[PDB]
Design a protein around this nucleic acid. Structure first.
Ligand code: ZN
Ligand code: ZN
Ligand code: ZN
Ligand code: ZN
Lengths: 676, 1287
RNA sequence: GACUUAAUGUCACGGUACCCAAUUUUCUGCCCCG
RNA sequence: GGGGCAGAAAAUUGG
């Protein structure tokens, strides 16, 4: 009969899709062709359709719902649409009774796996009680062939998560080889209350993840199991979080200079649980001080490993163009490895040490922990060789920062009083950076901020007192996006000074009349090809232009030069002659990074691309100031290349916040973004 | 302590939502999105009626925002009493949160009151908020409220029963469009309500403190928006008709089904819908087209008997029965009912199910836990705030389209649906947005989306709009768009839209794909709409000035406002005109603003207002920056789209068919040209006369097909997730097109007299030699000539970002159009729509000019056939022959199944053109049947027909259809092909007497004959194109002395062929094709001219003009993808050699129209190899092609005993080629001294023109006592056999 | 004044019904015996 | 003794 030929053709196509040898594009073409022929058969035989055809429609919709990649930091509605249509389709299948026993149990198992995936992807629509009733009826029918299908094993593990006791089914669950070690540990913990085999099989699972890519399902289910173990106050999550952190670190080791990582949602909560585990173990009493210092150093290492990369999206990965033909190849092997891992899960200079700092320096790391809603500052002192940490809260500081941001973006120069309020709130919320025990008096401080604290002025903090003293009046401050950007070997050794300039509305004609810029590379009316011709390590490069910020891709933030400007990727590729070069940028940071609407942000400016190239330091502005201030900075740097920036900020009137807030606004806007 | 009765009036369509109290609101998504709308509650049971209202909390929120803004303007004062900032936070420890939370910024100021507000005394702001009151957050008695807002109920003007939802509201789908790809992401629904009848609401406000009355009455005049519409707040002191039409449509469908004509019903439906464009007089004065003269049947379909009467009188009775619903609704309802009954009787209700395309998404209006923020904004003390208002008009420079969902889905109550359920579609596939009074509409959301798109382009950066939000976005685009207010537009025009059809082509076979017809409603061009914009802020932006200067038009510059949803086809480009900008200062003229209410709803008066009639406080704005000084212009907006404008010269007839307008217009014609309806603005009518045009879809498809054939991307089976060149330039499912096309308009249509030409065509049977039954038709194209060409001006826009290779592809497509590879319109294989030249305007960019500029013998066959020596080479002038003979091949046909495709230019195949000349050996008659009167002579004698020679604009021509039919008959007789045109009828039928292999090729499964492979069939386009022939040189006008015109001939009576003579005696079979003989039988007709104008009736014969011998005509044959043997057989069929010629025209039994075709030039081009101009193809390779064709014919015969070599072929070795070449042999060409005598018998002696003792009658030649039947059939199968002594 | 709001906090003017497709393919205004 | 044919067959929505 021709209907059976069409059905076996559709099943042949679906089993061609099931084989782990096809590419994702071939999978998309095969399953949507099978769905086309099945929907045509539906349109022909609309009410005289058999039940098994509707079952095949639901199975084809499940296979379609597998191969939809998540774009953005949310669940796409195409996946929910496919899941809800396959639920509706299998509902009118199971209301069409009197098939065989195999057809009935197959319909119940398809409905079970659809409800499981739809409950995982959406909570408010599909509650846990409906899942409990549906899976209880499905196991009342008897889908218990644990030696044939893994879907029954998934039903079993989900029911033990819900609470329906299956100690009668325990021997069949353990003896099955298709169930991997994570389901075995979950079965041993959830039913038998035996913890030792659970620890063994969890150790095997975390050992297995060290070669598995991040887009796999096992990462998501492992971190979810760790969070569930944390929620009932067990004693095994403290080891499992550290093991999964070590596995994720050794897996993320395998990337290159294009610092990317796959965006999956439970990355941050894994790092937060690992931080809380090491923090609690450091808070536990230990008579040996070296263990405690090592645990605080491990906290700093966790923070550094989080801050290292910046977690690009998926549509930005597909959207961005191709250049230099080898970074394209590394990007393409990363992308296709990640997508084939995602579908394969469902189808079946040298980096410095944390204590390698110069003498007389104090290093301060930050970590905003979203689970406890706290913020931790970790301090390393080299002269005493000691590690300490302290805590604070970050809600009211976020409110005052958003107030300053709104007032600035409406009235740029006239938000000076909100700037003073923000500096006083930094001084009130974080009082430990004025105490002598936490940070010694007269030492240079390096800040490594991680959150919206990248945008906060830390050097201009005001002490919570009557006659308040600024932070920069006794300390020299430096900044860095992450510790992995720090490098050695400055070695300027040259005396060439280069200028580039594109905008003529700013009055820099007195500056272009100068005599220091006597080399051939200095020109007005710059371009990108004129930027990539810098020959051999100038001592000071000055770029005077505007900035444009792509609000999704940090790779597309551009400096407004002629012939289309130069982007982040072109600075990473084309520019080669800038090793050991101090750079003074005229464009503000607010034009180079987009304004933020969440507590978390990870968007890197062109200054860190200059740091990845090899530059010695970048001195820039946090917000928009007058052109005369940048002119005075460039002149003071040209006459004096050895002097520090905090003396210039103190001398020009950076301590006049109580009487004239415009001078305090124009003074503290300048920031050095490079470590010696 | 006095009440205030308040009325709010809406000046725009507002938004409605269903009412749920507080928890069922959280159950629903539309209710959570639908806050700050107007609310609808049901009354009674059954979900049909109810009432609508507006809550008092919404009016309280609007009044509080207005008070805060007015206090922010005057630095925290109002009329001398200072105010504090107030409170907007609630501690969660004491009390509950007040059921609505604020996410926007709160304006604040310095509080200089030098007092803290207590319960005993407070400022006007604190007593207007209700801080120190006795009532809060739990309702009690309606006293102990210091200020109380009641609900606002709909002021129904006339008291009736309970109001229905379908009388007030109507549903609509809105959209969200991505910026990088140009495609929608998600959608959501809403209810829009009428403001003309149902836009007045009345409420009460009670105030128990005469200290904040002035601030409240001032703030009531500062509220500008409510429920999605502009507002003004003032203080006072037919089921039965559908059932009847369904019954009568059932009557019409059964009356059609009795005649076996059901498939016309579909066509009839469309025709009735087209009758909405005319008036009622087309059914009342009977202006529907009448049929041909003296015909018992009338029209094609307007004269089918329905229960005894004609269809037009039935439609008259139906219109008299249903005069109370208007003409438009009557036509639309009759068309829809006929379409529904046709779909029911056919069997398919067109289910319309879509896999994974819905994505209905509502923004999550609930606050996820956390993020309760308070953001104060403090303006500087000095700063000035102003409001700018821009008034003007929008004009459609192209036909526009604003999409809307189909009816029976835009019902507000019954939106309940399921994923599984299928959706019944309606008559029109794509509808247009209209008002309740059938007026055209530009909605607010489309204008706001286009302004957001152009502002993001002008800034160079922006955010994709996020829906679930806790913090307001601070990107530049959003900051400027939170200060812009618009207004919806309706025209003063209420005429029906125009239907435009679209198809899609199969690239392999070059015919129409299955299931690709659809129809779109478009609006007229030239329509005008009002335009109002408002901006409230501190300074006027430069980017907004750049966008406004971009949208407007002037001298030289044209407007660039793309609104709507068919932009790739060029639909929806508007221009902005009559722009006036006015300025209102708010720090000193706030009382005048409050008193005049901001001129909300009176902006129509501002357009005609003079300078001296303006109200107080409103000044003209003078510092509006010019176009050359705007820096966001000329850097971001001007290089975005670039224009290429060109002009095509067509030197042939041009036909883009309509086929429904031909049904509903007088003339009784089959295919007419395409016309447009253009609206005029000086006079408010449309226009008196239409404008002829070529569609934008057509030449968009021409460009796409040219690029796809040159690159090779048309051959791919699927284009899902594709990065090919064709999908990059011309878009796909995931990306919009990078190129936009507009129409080609005729620009020289007034230099013609009789712009349209009437050309009629017929099909000739291969056996009988006459016209086939129901195979006569007419065409009505535009009259283009080689010396009077048609000129069409067109335009297309290109985007910034194109590489050099894609510009090379576009330039190569333009060069392929210029060389003539892609003809415009229909019937291109018979010479219609052939492009003769191209021209490019001087404002085209320079690189395109350089790319288009840089891209710019006596051949004889010498073969002599040995003719039949027994008829004329033995006896010179004593024999009589028969004027037609029969050629009989065998039965077998070679059918090929690997059919050559049209989807690429293959490497081994050949393509090019042949220039040929045609010489007349006998007089030639080609009539012009457009004018039956012709010269004269109809008035003197009734009856008699007289024609002229075929001409377009006074130039004698031969049509390409005649040449194609003659060459097709010759090729099919040469290559032993099937009988292409055949008929089955009375004496069993003569379709059964034919062999089954000689039946016409139907379908591509069994294969195609060589004639159907070269010249084409219904489901396969051919690979040869014949053009119109032009007169060149020689004499003209054969002169007979005594005749009423000098260049003329009155021919003999000529009537239909009788197959009873050719096949009597039932055990007999069809003896093949019919051919005519070459002789000078026209001299008998010429000398016997007086005996023809008497002794026979003038109704029988025809008078015509003739051409003499020696005339030369020139024409062209184009070809693509030809094998070498097919080209060889074609070149042999064109020039078969010396003393062999063809037959063309009228009077072939009498000896008229012997033509000799001599090949002048052959050109072949190969575009797969890199580039060069077209070659010359010398004599050696074309002789090699003729040898390959001869070897293919030898291989097809089967007798392989004849050797192979480079010897000149003797064609008469094969039998049927010898019979054919004896039939087409001219015995008077080489200055020979013989002429035959070929004429018909006399039929029953003592009759017309019987020679004395010849015995040449049908009595003595059909009576079986001499020449029995087998000898008679054998006498017609041997060419040139004598009949008067009968061999 | 019930249906029909809660009051120290409503950016829904926070969202273009959008993207893709040649009204086309085949046809001599022709012509004799009961 | 005498005029015929005057349109026929598909596609009417799908991604
Ligand atoms: Zn107050
Ligand atoms: Zn925005
Ligand atoms: Zn493609
Ligand atoms: Zn054929």
């Amino acid at each position: 009969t021709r209907e059976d030929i069409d059905r076996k053709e559709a099943e042949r196509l679906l089993d061609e899709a099931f084989n782990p040898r096809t590419k994702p594009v071939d999978r998309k073409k095969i399953i949507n062709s099978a769905l086309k022929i099945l929907i045509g058969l539906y349109k022909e035989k609309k009410d005289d359709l058999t039940s098994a055809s509707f079952i095949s429609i639901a199975r084809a919709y499940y296979l379609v719902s597998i191969t939809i990649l998540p774009k953005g930091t949310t669940i796409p509605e195409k996946k929910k649409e496919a899941l809800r249509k396959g639920i509706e389709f299998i509902d009118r299948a199971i209301n069409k009774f009197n098939g065989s026993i195999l057809d009935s149990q197959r319909a119940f198992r398809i409905k079970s796996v659809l409800s499981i995936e739809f409950n995982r992807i959406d909570r408010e629509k599909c509650d846990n009680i409906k899942l409990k009733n549906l899976l209880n009826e499905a196991v009342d029918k008897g889908c218990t062939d644990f030696d044939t299908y893994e879907w029954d094993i998934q039903i079993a593990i989900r029911l033990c998560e819900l609470g329906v006791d299956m100690e009668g089914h325990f021997d069949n669950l353990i003896k099955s080889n298709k169930a991997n070690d994570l389901q075995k540990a979950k079965a041993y913990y959830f039913i038998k209350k035996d913890d030792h085999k659970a620890k063994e099989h969890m150790d095997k699972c975390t050992a297995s993840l060290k070669y598995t890519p991040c887009s796999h399902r096992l990462w998501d289910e492992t971190v979810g199991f760790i969070e569930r173990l944390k929620g009932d106050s067990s004693t095994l999550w403290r080891d499992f979080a550290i093991k999964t952190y070590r596995s994720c670190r050794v897996q993320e080791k395998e990337t290159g200079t294009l610092r990317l990582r796959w965006y999956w949602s439970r990355h941050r909560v894994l790092y937060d649980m690992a931080f809380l585990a090491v923090k609690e173990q450091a808070d536990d009493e230990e008579p040996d001080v070296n263990v405690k210092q090592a645990k605080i150093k491990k906290l700093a290492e966790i923070s550094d490993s989080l801050k290292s990369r910046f977690s690009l999206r998926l549509s930005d990965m597909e959207k961005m163009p191709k250049s230099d033909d080898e970074s394209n190849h590394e990007f393409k092997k990363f992308l296709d490895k990640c997508v084939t891992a995602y579908q394969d899960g469902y189808v079946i200079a040298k980096l410095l040490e944390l204590t390698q700092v110069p003498e007389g320096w104090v290093v301060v790391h930050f970590y905003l922990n979203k689970l406890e809603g706290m913020g931790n500052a970790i301090v390393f002192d080299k002269c005493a060789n000691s590690w300490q940490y302290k805590e604070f809260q970050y809600k009211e500081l976020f409110e005052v920062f958003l107030t300053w941001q709104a007032n600035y973006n409406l009235y740029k120069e006239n938000a000076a009083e909100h700037l003073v309020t923000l500096c006083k709130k930094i001084g009130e919320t974080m009082p430990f950076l004025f105490c002598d025990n936490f940070i010694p008096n007269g030492k240079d401080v390096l800040f490594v901020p991680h959150d919206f604290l990248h945008r906060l002025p830390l050097h201009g903090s005001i002490e919570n007192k009557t006659n308040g003293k600024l932070f920069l009046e006794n300390h020299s401050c430096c900044y860095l996006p992450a510790w992995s950007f720090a490098s050695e070997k400055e070695a300027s050794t040259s005396d060439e000074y280069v200028l580039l300039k594109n905008f003529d509305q700013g009055h820099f004609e007195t500056l272009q009349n100068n005599q220091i810029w006597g080399t051939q590379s200095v020109k007005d009316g710059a371009s990108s090809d004129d930027l990539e011709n810098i020959r051999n390590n100038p001592r000071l490069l000055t770029i005077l232009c505007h900035g444009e910020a792509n609000m999704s891709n940090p790779f597309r933030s551009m400096l407004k030069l002629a012939n289309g400007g130069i982007t982040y990727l072109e600075i990473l590729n084309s520019v080669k002659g800038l090793k050991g070069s101090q750079v003074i940028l005229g464009a503000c940071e607010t034009d180079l990074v987009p304004p933020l609407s969440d507590v978390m942000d990870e968007h890197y400016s062109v200054a860190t691309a200059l740091l990845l190239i090899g530059a010695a330091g970048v001195v820039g502005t946090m917000w928009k100031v007058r052109s005369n201030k940048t002119k005075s900075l460039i002149e003071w740097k040209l006459e004096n290349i050895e002097y520090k920036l905090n003396e210039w900020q103190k001398e020009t009137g950076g301590a006049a916040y109580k009487d004239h807030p415009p001078t305090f606004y124009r003074s503290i806007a300048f920031r050095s973004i490079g470590f010696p | 302590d006095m009440n205030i009765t308040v009325e709010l009036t809406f000046f725009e369509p507002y938004r409605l939502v269903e009412w749920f109290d507080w928890d069922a609101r959280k159950k629903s998504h539309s209710a959570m999105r639908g806050q700050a709308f107007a609310q609808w509650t049901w009354k009674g049971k059954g979900r049909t009626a109810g009432k609508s209202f507006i809550t008092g909390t919404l009016v309280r929120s609007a009044v509080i925002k207005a008070v805060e803004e007015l206090l922010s303007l005057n630095n925290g004062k109002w009329e001398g009493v200072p105010c504090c900032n107030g409170s907007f936070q609630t501690d969660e420890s004491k009390g509950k949160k007040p059921s609505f939370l604020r996410k926007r910024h709160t304006l604040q100021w310095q509080a200089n009151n030098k007092n803290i507000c207590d319960k005993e005394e407070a400022c006007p702001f604190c007593i207007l908020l209700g801080r120190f009151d006795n009532a809060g957050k739990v309702h009690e008695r309606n006293k102990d409220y210091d200020i109380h807002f009641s609900n606002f109920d709909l002021d129904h003007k006339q008291e009736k029963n309970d109001l229905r939802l379908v009388d007030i509201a109507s549903g609509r789908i809105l959209n969200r469009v991505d910026f990088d790809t140009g495609k929608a992401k998600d959608y959501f629904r809403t209810w829009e309500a009428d403001y003309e009848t149902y836009g007045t609401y009345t409420g009460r406000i009670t105030l128990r403190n005469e200290h904040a009355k002035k601030l409240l009455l001032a703030s009531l005049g500062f509220v500008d928006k409510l429920c999605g519409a502009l507002c003004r707040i003032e203080v006072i002191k037919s089921e039965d008709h559908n059932d009847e039409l369904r019954k009568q449509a059932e009557v019409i469908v059964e009356a059609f089904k009795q005649n076996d004509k059901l498939e016309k019903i579909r066509i009839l439906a469309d025709a009735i819908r087209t009758l909405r464009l005319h008036g009622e007089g087309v059914i009342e004065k009977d202006e529907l087209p009448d049929g041909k003269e003296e015909r018992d049947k009338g029209h094609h379909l307007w004269d089918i008997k329905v229960q005894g009467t004609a269809l037009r009188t039935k439609l008259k009775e139906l219109w008299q029965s249903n005069k109370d619903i208007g003409w438009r609704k009557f036509t639309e309802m009759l068309g829809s009912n006929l379409y529904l009954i046709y779909k029911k009787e056919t069997g398919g209700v067109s289910t319309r199910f879509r896999i994974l395309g819905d994505t209905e998404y509502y923004s999550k209006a609930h606050d996820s836990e956390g993020s309760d923020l308070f953001i104060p904004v403090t303006p500087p003390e000095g700063i000035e705030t102003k409001e700018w208002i821009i008034v003007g008009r929008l004009k459609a420079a192209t036909p526009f389209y604003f999409g809307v969902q189909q009816p029976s889905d835009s019902i507000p109550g019954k939106e309940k649906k399921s994923e599984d359920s299928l959706v019944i579609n309606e008559h029109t596939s794509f509808n247009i947005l209209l008002d309740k009074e059938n007026r055209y509409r530009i909605p607010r959301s489309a204008l706001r989306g286009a302004l957001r798109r152009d502002l993001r382009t002008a800034f160079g950066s922006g955010c994709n709009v996020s829906l679930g939000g806790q913090i307001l976005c601070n990107c530049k685009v959003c900051i400027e768009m939170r200060r812009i207010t618009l207004k919806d537009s309706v025209s003063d025009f209420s005429e029906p839209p125009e239907i435009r059809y679209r198809i899609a082509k199969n690239p392999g076979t070059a015919t129409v794909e299955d299931g690709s017809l659809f129809d779109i409603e478009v609006g007229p061009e030239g329509l005008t709409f009002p335009f109002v914009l408002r901006y409230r802020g501190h300074k006027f932006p430069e980017q907004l000035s750049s966008v406004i200067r971009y949208w407007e038009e002037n001298d030289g510059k044209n407007g660039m406002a793309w609104l709507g949803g068919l932009d790739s086809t060029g639909k929806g480009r508007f221009a902005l005109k009559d722009i006036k900008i006015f300025e209102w200062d708010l720090n000193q003229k706030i009382n005048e603003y409050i008193k005049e209410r901001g001129m909300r709803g009176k902006e129509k008066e501002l357009l005609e207002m003079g300078e001296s009639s303006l109200p107080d406080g409103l000044i003209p704005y003078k510092f509006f920056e010019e176009r050359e000084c705007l820096f966001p212009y000329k850097e971001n907006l001007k290089p975005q789209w670039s224009e290429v404008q060109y002009t095509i010269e067509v030197g042939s007839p041009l036909l883009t068919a309509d086929t429904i307008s031909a049904l509903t217009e007088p003339g009784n014609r089959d295919a007419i040209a395409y016309k447009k309806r253009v609206y005029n603005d000086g006079n408010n009518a449309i226009e008196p006369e239409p404008r002829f045009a070529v569609k934008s879809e057509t030449h968009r498809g021409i460009f796409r097909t040219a690029v796809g054939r040159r690159t090779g991307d048309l051959g791919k089976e699927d284009h899902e997730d594709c990065t090919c060149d064709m999908c990059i330039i011309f878009g796909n499912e995931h990306e919009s097109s990078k190129i936009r096309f507009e129409d080609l308009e005729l620009i020289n249509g007034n230099e013609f007299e009789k712009l349209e030409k009437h050309i009629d065509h017929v099909a000739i049977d291969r056996f009988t030699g006459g016209a086939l039954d129901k195979a006569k038709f007419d065409t009505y194209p535009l009259a283009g000539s080689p010396k009077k060409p048609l000129k069409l001006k067109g335009r297309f826009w290109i985007k910034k970002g194109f590489s050099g290779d894609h510009k090379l592809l576009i330039t190569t497509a333009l060069s392929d159009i210029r060389d003539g590879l892609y003809p415009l319109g229909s019937k291109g294989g018979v010479g219609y729509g052939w492009v003769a030249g191209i021209s490019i305007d001087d404002n085209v960019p320079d690189d395109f000019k350089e790319m288009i500029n840089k891209t710019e013998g006596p051949i004889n066959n010498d073969y002599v056939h040995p003719g039949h020596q027994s008829p004329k080479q033995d006896h010179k002038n004593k024999n009589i022959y028969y004027p037609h003979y029969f050629l009989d091949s065998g039965s077998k046909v070679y059918r090929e199944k690997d059919i050559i495709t049209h989807e690429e230019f293959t490497e081994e195949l050949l393509s090019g053109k042949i220039n040929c000349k045609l010489e007349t050996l006998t007089p030639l008659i080609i009539p012009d049947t457009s004018d039956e009167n012709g010269l004269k002579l109809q008035g003197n004698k009734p009856g008699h027909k007289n024609y002229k020679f075929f001409n377009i604009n006074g130039e004698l021509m031969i049509p390409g259809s005649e040449l194609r039919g003659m060459l097709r008959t010759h090729f099919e007789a040469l290559t032993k092909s099937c009988f292409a045109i055949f008929g089955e009828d009375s004496t069993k039928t003569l379709g059964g007497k034919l062999d089954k292999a000689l039946h016409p090729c139907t379908g591509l499964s069994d294969g195609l004959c060589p004639g159907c492979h070269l010249f084409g069939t219904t489901d396969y386009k051919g690979r040869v194109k014949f053009g119109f022939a032009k007169y060149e040189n020689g004499p003209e006008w054969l002169i007979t002395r005594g005749n009423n015109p000098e260049r003329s001939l009155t021919l003999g009576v000529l009537e239909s062929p009788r197959p009873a003579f050719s096949i009597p005696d039932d055990e007999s079979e069809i003896p093949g094709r019919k051919f005519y003989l070459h002789h000078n039988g026209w001299r008998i007709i010429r000398q016997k001219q007086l005996e023809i104008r008497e002794t026979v009736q003038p109704e029988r014969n025809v008078t015509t003009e003739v051409m003499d011998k020696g005339n030369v005509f020139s024409f062209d044959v184009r070809f693509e993808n030809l094998r070498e043997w097919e080209l060889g057989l074609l070149l042999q069929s064109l020039d078969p050699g010396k003393n062999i010629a063809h037959k063309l025209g009228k009077g072939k039994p009498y000896g008229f129209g012997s033509v000799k075709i001599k090949i002048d030039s052959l050109h072949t081009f190969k575009i797969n190899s890199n580039n060069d101009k077209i070659k010359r193809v010398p004599q050696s390779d074309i002789r090699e092609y003729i040898n390959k064709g001869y070897q293919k014919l030898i291989e097809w015969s089967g007798n392989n005993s004849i050797q192979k070599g480079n010897v000149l072929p003797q064609w008469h070795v094969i039998p049927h080629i010898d019979k054919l070449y004896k039939l087409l042999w001219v015995p008077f060409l080489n200055d020979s001294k013989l002429e035959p005598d070929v004429r018909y018998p006399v039929l029953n002696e003592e009759s017309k023109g019987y020679i004395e003792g010849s015995d040449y009658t049908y009595k003595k030649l059909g009576d079986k006592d001499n020449l029995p039947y087998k000898t008679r059939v054998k006498g017609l199968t041997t060419p040139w056999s004598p009949w008067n002594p009968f061999q």
